[PDB]
Write a protein that binds this ligand. Structure first.
Ligand SMILES: *[C@@H]1O[C@H](CO)[C@@H](O[C@@H]2O[C@H](CO)[C@@H](O[C@@H]3O[C@H](CO[C@H]4O[C@H](CO)[C@@H](O)[C@H](O)[C@@H]4O)[C@@H](O)[C@H](O)[C@@H]3O)[C@H](O)[C@H]2NC(C)=O)[C@H](O)[C@H]1NC(C)=O
Ligand SMILES: *[C@@H]1O[C@H](CO)[C@@H](O[C@@H]2O[C@H](CO)[C@@H](O[C@@H]3O[C@H](CO[C@H]4O[C@H](CO)[C@@H](O)[C@H](O)[C@@H]4O)[C@@H](O)[C@H](O)[C@@H]3O)[C@H](O)[C@H]2NC(C)=O)[C@H](O)[C@H]1NC(C)=O
Ligand SMILES: *[C@@H]1O[C@H](CO)[C@@H](O[C@@H]2O[C@H](CO)[C@@H](O[C@@H]3O[C@H](CO[C@H]4O[C@H](CO)[C@@H](O)[C@H](O)[C@@H]4O)[C@@H](O)[C@H](O)[C@@H]3O)[C@H](O)[C@H]2NC(C)=O)[C@H](O)[C@H]1NC(C)=O
Ligand SMILES: *[C@@H]1O[C@H](CO)[C@@H](O[C@@H]2O[C@H](CO)[C@@H](O[C@@H]3O[C@H](CO[C@H]4O[C@H](CO)[C@@H](O)[C@H](O)[C@@H]4O)[C@@H](O)[C@H](O)[C@@H]3O)[C@H](O)[C@H]2NC(C)=O)[C@H](O)[C@H]1NC(C)=O
Ligand SMILES: *[C@@H]1O[C@H](CO)[C@@H](O[C@@H]2O[C@H](CO)[C@@H](O[C@@H]3O[C@H](CO[C@H]4O[C@H](CO)[C@@H](O)[C@H](O)[C@@H]4O)[C@@H](O)[C@H](O)[C@@H]3O)[C@H](O)[C@H]2NC(C)=O)[C@H](O)[C@H]1NC(C)=O
Ligand SMILES: *[C@@H]1O[C@H](CO)[C@@H](O[C@@H]2O[C@H](CO)[C@@H](O[C@@H]3O[C@H](CO[C@H]4O[C@H](CO)[C@@H](O)[C@H](O)[C@@H]4O)[C@@H](O)[C@H](O)[C@@H]3O)[C@H](O)[C@H]2NC(C)=O)[C@H](O)[C@H]1NC(C)=O
Ligand SMILES: *[C@@H]1O[C@H](CO)[C@@H](O[C@@H]2O[C@H](CO)[C@@H](O[C@@H]3O[C@H](CO)[C@@H](O)[C@H](O)[C@@H]3O)[C@H](O)[C@H]2NC(C)=O)[C@H](O)[C@H]1NC(C)=O
Ligand SMILES: *[C@@H]1O[C@H](CO)[C@@H](O[C@@H]2O[C@H](CO)[C@@H](O[C@@H]3O[C@H](CO)[C@@H](O)[C@H](O)[C@@H]3O)[C@H](O)[C@H]2NC(C)=O)[C@H](O)[C@H]1NC(C)=O
Ligand SMILES: *[C@@H]1O[C@H](CO)[C@@H](O[C@@H]2O[C@H](CO)[C@@H](O[C@@H]3O[C@H](CO)[C@@H](O)[C@H](O)[C@@H]3O)[C@H](O)[C@H]2NC(C)=O)[C@H](O)[C@H]1NC(C)=O
Ligand SMILES: *[C@@H]1O[C@H](CO)[C@@H](O[C@@H]2O[C@H](CO)[C@@H](O)[C@H](O)[C@H]2NC(C)=O)[C@H](O)[C@H]1NC(C)=O
Ligand SMILES: *[C@@H]1O[C@H](CO)[C@@H](O[C@@H]2O[C@H](CO)[C@@H](O)[C@H](O)[C@H]2NC(C)=O)[C@H](O)[C@H]1NC(C)=O
Ligand SMILES: *[C@@H]1O[C@H](CO)[C@@H](O[C@@H]2O[C@H](CO)[C@@H](O)[C@H](O)[C@H]2NC(C)=O)[C@H](O)[C@H]1NC(C)=O
Ligand SMILES: *[C@@H]1O[C@H](CO)[C@@H](O)[C@H](O)[C@H]1NC(C)=O
Ligand SMILES: *[C@@H]1O[C@H](CO)[C@@H](O)[C@H](O)[C@H]1NC(C)=O
Ligand SMILES: *[C@@H]1O[C@H](CO)[C@@H](O)[C@H](O)[C@H]1NC(C)=O
Lengths: 324, 172, 172, 172, 324, 324
């Protein structure tokens, strides 16, 4: 029945409401109902690591360091570069048992460099046998060694004091990997290097490092009681690598090129797959449209910030006030 | 809300207005009506859209960082690595909490404000031709057809043309 | 305050109201009166109570951390430990400063808002039966005994029953 | 603004008022006028001046710190040094962004508030002797010379002396 | 005189005020008076360390490390666990003068473990005398040694090259403490170990550490010019501890159990007493009802956050506006 | 034409506007025009380092360490103190080629101390020649050595085992700089020190450090194939410095006074000049009236906080609304 308004009319103001709103928090109230809210925390991973848009290298069975040293089962990585190198828990070494003082630092340095490509240099080793091998480091079926290292031994009945140079006449820092052999017994020491005690001194104009080997049995891994200790030196442009040894030197074959890199390494066990993402986590890639992130504090790329909270609801509408 | 409009002198929202965020209902010589208000709706939406983008800068490309999880015990320098990451995360967690709460406060405050401004805008056009009925409505003391109401909704009401009729009817 | 009620058009607060945060005084045919307003009082209290708890999460159990004070000089890694703790503390100090100031702003803004909403709520019931006297009071143009005043305080005033008397008295 | 005064029911600001932040224009029996309002102007200025100083504590004397830039590659502990400084800087950058935005919001909100309070202050003195014209002006229904206007600007207008004249003229 | 209201009444709105309010700060004003405020900074300590609710262990005269090594005057700690270990400034060693490279790291590791309980293992030392003693380390009145270490010496005219194993066939990391003896003179070296120069090599599959002793006089402390250097090794489940020595070995008797612990250590000189608290500081326990804290940046438990400011006042009422 | 107002008047409220306002950002809008804004970020340096109000020491050709060691071309710094020491990229060593393990730490320690003033102590070196020299370290035209170090050599055909003490009976920590000589060949080793292998052990009650030299050629710098390795020891009040050596000792002449200092060191290549500032950056001094700062993250003094943003505009007026 209409209309009523003979000499009058009424005009009411109002706003919309929805049947079922959602609770958000403000400074004034713990919980208040609004028409619409948006989630600010990314809690779901994609479940996989996306092959795009970054260049992802799956280590599979190799650590970054083993691939860099040139462990036989890591020969397929020898010409490889990456933005992000994935290390699997599954990884294992399968060459001569070794250790590296400040391993993490070296791993960090190579990871940043984003490459394991190697440049051979014409090092000259007078009075010594080169390319020493070991049954603990099979290459195919024949026994071998780390492709980037050069196991030097006596030639005949002689091991003379090597003193070798290598200038850096290029515009970048050269990274040299080298090491020492710790023989399991004195029979082996004198059989391999003649002298009862070895030493190695690698130096430049600005720095030096001297290492003495410790002869003695360590626990057996891959048939070997002996060890190799790995060290490194960074030769600056215009500086010169010097190497001095009366025995036990595990020599470099060349250098790696250090470059300011936006590359890194990440421990993860999720598969890599065909998809696109700009942020990567040990749980997989994650979307980055949201500004916050509760999947993992370990990230790489354009990543939302990691926070403790699992959900944060941003109001995108007014307070919802349905009848009554 | 600090303006006391939404869940205040406007008793409730209207589910049957799917046409906008704010609007009008009315009763007049040509029947009853409803109409959304675009100006107010857009004013509120424009403040809500891209709100975070005013404070949070574009997602920043981060590359090689520190280890944050560890296989073996080491001591001193591992304690420092953990404590740095723990500190970082607690600070950003705090920031995120603070931001959402004051951002939501602002959303609720601003949407109540638009409801109030629309009521005040309407009151000001009507001048002495209408009275506040105390519930978000105005009694208009003259005959006001759909074109008349539209002039109010559209900001074109000329109160002078109705003034004398309004006064005649207003005191009985 | 942005509403201009507290230390504004209400000249001062009342010490003799120990009964609530907001209320009424009045003068009528049965004498003078005072009465607290519970609704408004509780609305303000509820926003003030547990305010920090909305932003600051529950005190978090922290165990083994780093050294923060040192017996001897060491250099590099001690500089880093100190700088990390110094950085942490300056950031939380800033947060604490910011939080209290904007939290207090909000308290002052919200308590002024409730004073304003109560005045507006009262104005809206009275309609044309009263006038704003410019000082936070209304002149009511009809006889209003204690029950009448109570209906206003309680949101039950029906202005229609008094309308004609109010108009009779209002223009002289 | 949430009060809808500046760029709201006041259509625009006045360039020809170099004398203050807020003020009056008027038309009366002695001609047209303009006058700044000091009270409101100072109330706003006093809130704007030293705003940062309420939140940011005095510049703090900092001496020996860590290295933040490096000549050679080192690895682990250099990664941590960089990450600490990077973390610090991103947190203060965020703080700075947040602070300016909410500080500016507050400035805009508070200056609109003063414009509104001045209109409300003026409305309250005038009582039923004037009407809101819907544009930030009042029609005053009596003869009001420069002294009369000054009493309004200065908070001294006594509406009772003009009341009867105002009513005579107000209903035609 | 009443009532006035014949055809009218007046109704005024208002708010309360108190006689004496309190100044707080806002974004708008440096100081503004409010009816009531609450303090947000805890500046008062309890003055004591509460025995509840955490398990507090007072070191009294012992450092955490000495108790762990087994210094005689620390025998009462040998079966002890804690959530928080209190070290007093008063503490002192009273055994053989020693040092520990990266002492802080070890202290940190044991502190986290929250226990000093020791598990003996059946190590076998062929060709050497065990349980060496010293007048610098009295146990009661008889002279003794660190209870957790085993000072090995020549038997007869012989000190053979010891090579001892100890596998970790348990599901947790074992922490081994061991060391080396630095004799003050060559008379002592050969009298104790026969060989003119000693060495010790402790290894596992993944790691090794070799230490050589330096013979020579150090400053006298507790009658001793010689020293013992202390080191440690963490043996992972499935790995094996190997020890090799031709002299100067200060041998372990067993291991400590490493566990992910919410335990720590704290330097303090306030007494422990009967009371309850969930937060502990070098100044004592502090209440934690407030969210901020200016007592000390060193804390343990459920602690308010430390900040520079000594007071922060939160308004819990409206602006106070008394007459006039 | 006037005035109009016979029985009426109108009174309008308003606010000011300016012809040309400026854009700021708020929580509500990306850009909004205001009457006036103020810049919060300092992006301009002064271009120079101000001689006031801090005490600035220009290293010119010297590193902080060389000045501390007493390199001849750094003799003018020997009595110097500073609040801030400026190191130039231009700097170079011109004495015997050396290295320092944890160089940065030492540099950091001396920088904090804010002084290079040295206190000679009456060390007694029986059976050895003192004040050894080198053509690689010219002082004037005559050849010399680091003024703070004492190169000890054999006297006649003898180099006896030195064991020297020096108690710290003062109320502060003493910092001792010392080192070792690494000869380039065994001819030189035995010619200088007689014994085929040297060693140096510096100790106190609480600590010890032993160093062995490595004989062998390093790359030539300033005519020298040999090296000196520099180390340091901090002797606490009531402790005692002990030094023991059968050869290769580069001895201290005394100590430096460690003090809790508000001094530091800064790498920079801008000139120092006459002006006043309370904040210093590698780009020069900067004003500190603003609270934020985008010039450099490296600062010293009362400095605005460094942030990523290059500009941040604070509104200091209302929204600007000109006609129309
Ligand atoms: C110092 O003491 C150490 C502890 O006894 C000695 O180390 C041990 O040295 C012997 C050989 O000298 C090794 O014995 C060999 O073990 C390998 C491998 O184990 C076999 O069994 C496992 C079962 O799990 C199986 O998986 C393998 O495939 C093998 O079938 C055998 O191939 C040899 O025949 C022989 O038994 C010990 O393994 C080794 N243990 C450790 C922990 O290193 C060390 O020789 C001593 N050095 C001295 C006195 O100078
Ligand atoms: C991102 O990847 C992460 C890596 O897997 C996922 O987090 C892991 O979730 C698993 C399964 O629930 C948890 O594994 C459990 O560990 C606890 C032992 O507690 C210790 O870990 C906590 C961390 O929460 C740490 O604070 C303490 O040191 C504890 O001692 C066992 O009780 C269970 O049996 C089980 O092994 C891990 O806690 C957690 N990993 C890490 C590194 O924190 C995570 O779920 C992934 N993201 C998403 C969205 O799923
Ligand atoms: C290298 O030079 C070092 C410096 O001279 C030599 O060290 C000194 O060695 C002698 C013994 O060879 C010690 O002398 C003994 O001191 C103890 C303790 O001191 C007494 O007096 C104090 C007073 O404060 C009192 O408190 C004590 O209870 C003792 O009564 C006496 O017990 C002995 O009788 C004797 O005097 C020096 O103490 C010691 N000094 C330091 C700093 O080590 C070292 O022997 C030399 N080594 C060589 C040449 O190979
Ligand atoms: C929590 O326990 C703390 C540990 O005692 C208490 O703080 C200590 O208060 C004492 C007594 O006032 C202060 O001792 C003084 O030290 C100064 C030297 O200044 C150096 O210390 C400052 C720290 O403020 C540092 O920034 C610089 O390195 C300074 O060089 C002497 O002038 C005095 O003679 C006296 O020895 C300590 O400053 C302070 N200790 C620490 C570690 O900061 C604190 O009071 C306790 N909490 C409460 C609520 O009382
Ligand atoms: C180990 O092998 C090393 C590599 O060959 C040997 O090092 C070299 O040793 C010889 C002397 O034994 C040095 O030759 C001298 O060089 C200096 C300086 O160079 C001159 O030319 C430059 C041009 O840039 C000029 O600027 C200078 O002013 C000089 O005019 C000359 O003064 C000598 O006459 C002589 O030529 C090498 O410099 C040096 N090289 C390095 C990198 O150290 C080392 O001797 C071998 N050690 C052994 C076998 O025990
Ligand atoms: C404060 O002093 C600073 C020190 O000089 C000034 O900043 C420097 O500005 C110069 C000149 O533009 C830049 O030098 C360039 O370096 C880049 C290489 O990029 C690398 O540097 C960036 C830092 O931006 C870093 O993130 C990456 O590692 C990059 O690999 C070359 O492309 C150019 O050819 C040129 O050499 C420096 O980038 C920058 N120095 C530093 C340490 O960041 C600064 O301008 C001064 N303040 C003011 C207000 O002027
Ligand atoms: C409630 O609020 C939410 C969020 O504010 C609204 O839903 C979301 O609307 C946005 C755009 O307004 C959608 O954004 C997407 O962004 C990506 C970025 O590249 C773009 O590629 C997509 O095409 C899309 O625009 C988002 O998908 C959408 N989410 C959902 C779940 O609907 C929504 O409009 C609001 N609801 C109501 C009833 O108003
Ligand atoms: C002024 O504001 C303060 C604080 O907002 C009020 O005083 C405090 O009131 C709280 C509860 O409202 C008391 O809290 C205590 O908390 C512990 C937590 O477990 C509980 O166990 C205690 O039983 C107690 O509830 C606190 O004691 C109290 N403090 C003081 C000094 O009185 C106060 O109500 C306000 N004053 C006025 C006049 O409104
Ligand atoms: C627009 O706002 C700005 C800043 O809020 C105003 O300009 C600035 O005014 C301040 C003082 O109000 C001046 O501060 C200076 O501080 C140092 C500190 O020691 C003092 O020594 C100086 O004597 C001076 O007071 C500052 O110089 C000035 N800057 C500029 C560029 O003018 C300005 O008043 C506002 N403009 C308008 C039209 O309102
Ligand atoms: C909106 O929310 C309401 C309340 O939670 C929902 O109403 C009910 O729906 C469930 C399952 O669909 C029924 O079991 C209940 O009986 C309903 N509520 C009542 C009070 O009877 C409603 O489903 C939601 N709106 C949707 C799904 O559109
Ligand atoms: C409230 O504050 C006022 C002002 O500080 C106090 O008033 C005085 O009290 C002191 C000591 O009790 C006297 O010496 C002064 O003479 C008083 N003021 C004046 C202006 O004369 C008052 O004590 C406080 N309220 C209390 C304690 O309840
Ligand atoms: C205020 O801003 C305006 C608009 O940017 C300026 O107006 C002009 O000035 C430029 C150069 O002086 C001229 O080329 C333009 O033709 C002008 N604008 C228009 C629309 O014609 C003005 O200069 C600024 N105010 C000043 C400098 O006081
Ligand atoms: C309402 O006013 C109109 C004027 O046109 C007229 O119909 C009458 O006066 C009033 N009511 C009814 C029901 O007719
Ligand atoms: C007030 O009104 C009442 C009406 O009942 C009446 O007493 C008279 O008109 C007025 N005043 C006085 C003093 O009587
Ligand atoms: C305006 O009012 C005045 C009263 O003094 C008188 O002049 C007349 O009534 C009105 N207008 C004009 C133009 O005279």
């Amino acid at each position: 029945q209409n209309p009523s308004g003979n000499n009058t009319a009424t005009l009411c103001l109002g706003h919309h409401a929805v049947a079922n709103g959602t609770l958000v928090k403000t400074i004034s109230d713990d919980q208040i109902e609004v028409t619409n809210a948006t989630e600010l925390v990314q809690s779901i991973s994609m479940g996989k690591i996306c092959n795009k848009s970054y260049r992802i290298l799956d280590g599979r069975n190799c650590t970054l360091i083993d691939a860099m040293l040139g462990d036989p089962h890591c020969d397929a990585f020898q010409y490889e570069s990456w933005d992000l190198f994935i290390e699997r828990s599954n990884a294992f070494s399968n060459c001569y048992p070794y250790d590296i003082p400040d391993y993490a630092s070296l791993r960090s340095i190579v990871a940043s460099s984003g490459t394991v490509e190697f440049t051979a240099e014409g090092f000259t080793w007078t009075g010594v046998t080169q390319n020493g091998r070991s049954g603990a480091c099979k290459r195919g079926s024949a026994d071998s060694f780390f492709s980037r290292l050069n196991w030097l031994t006596k030639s005949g009945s002689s091991y003379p004091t090597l003193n070798v140079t290598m200038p850096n006449n290029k515009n970048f820092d050269k990274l040299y990997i080298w090491g020492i052999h710790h023989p399991s017994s004195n029979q082996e020491q004198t059989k391999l290097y003649i002298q009862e005690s070895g030493r190695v001194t690698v130096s430049t104009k600005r720095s030096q490092q001297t290492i003495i080997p410790n002869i003695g049995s360590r626990p057996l891994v891959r048939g070997q009681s002996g060890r190799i200790s790995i060290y490194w030196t960074i030769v600056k442009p215009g500086d010169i690598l010097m190497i001095n040894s009366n025995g036990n030197l595990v020599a470099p074959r060349g250098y790696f090129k250090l470059n300011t890199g936006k590359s890194s390494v990440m421990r993860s066990d999720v598969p890599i797959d065909i998809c696109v993402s700009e942020c990567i986590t040990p749980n997989g890639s994650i979307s980055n449209d949201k500004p916050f992130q509760n999947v993992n504090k370990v990230t790489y790329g354009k990543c939302p910030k990691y926070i403790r909270q699992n959900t944060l609801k941003l109001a995108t509408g007014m307070r919802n006030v349905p009848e009554k | 809300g600090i303006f006391g409009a939404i869940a205040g002198f406007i008793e409730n929202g209207w589910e049957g207005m799917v046409d906008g965020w704010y609007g009008f209902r009315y009763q007049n010589s040509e029947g009853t009506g409803q109409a959304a208000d675009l100006k107010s709706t857009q004013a509120a939406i424009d403040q809500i859209n891209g709100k975070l983008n005013r404070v949070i800068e574009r997602t920043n490309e981060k590359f090689h960082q520190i280890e944050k999880e560890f296989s073996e015990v080491e001591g001193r320098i591992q304690d420092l690595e953990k404590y740095v990451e723990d500190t970082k995360i607690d600070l950003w967690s705090y920031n995120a909490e603070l931001l959402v709460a004051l951002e939501n406060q602002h959303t609720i405050d601003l949407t109540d404000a638009e409801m109030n401004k629309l009521f005040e805008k309407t009151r000001r056009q009507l001048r002495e031709n209408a009275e506040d009925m105390g519930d978000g409505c105005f009694k208009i003391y003259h005959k006001c057809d759909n074109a008349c109401i539209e002039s109010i909704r559209t900001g074109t009401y000329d109160h002078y043309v109705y003034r004398d009729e309004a006064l005649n009817n207003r005191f009985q």
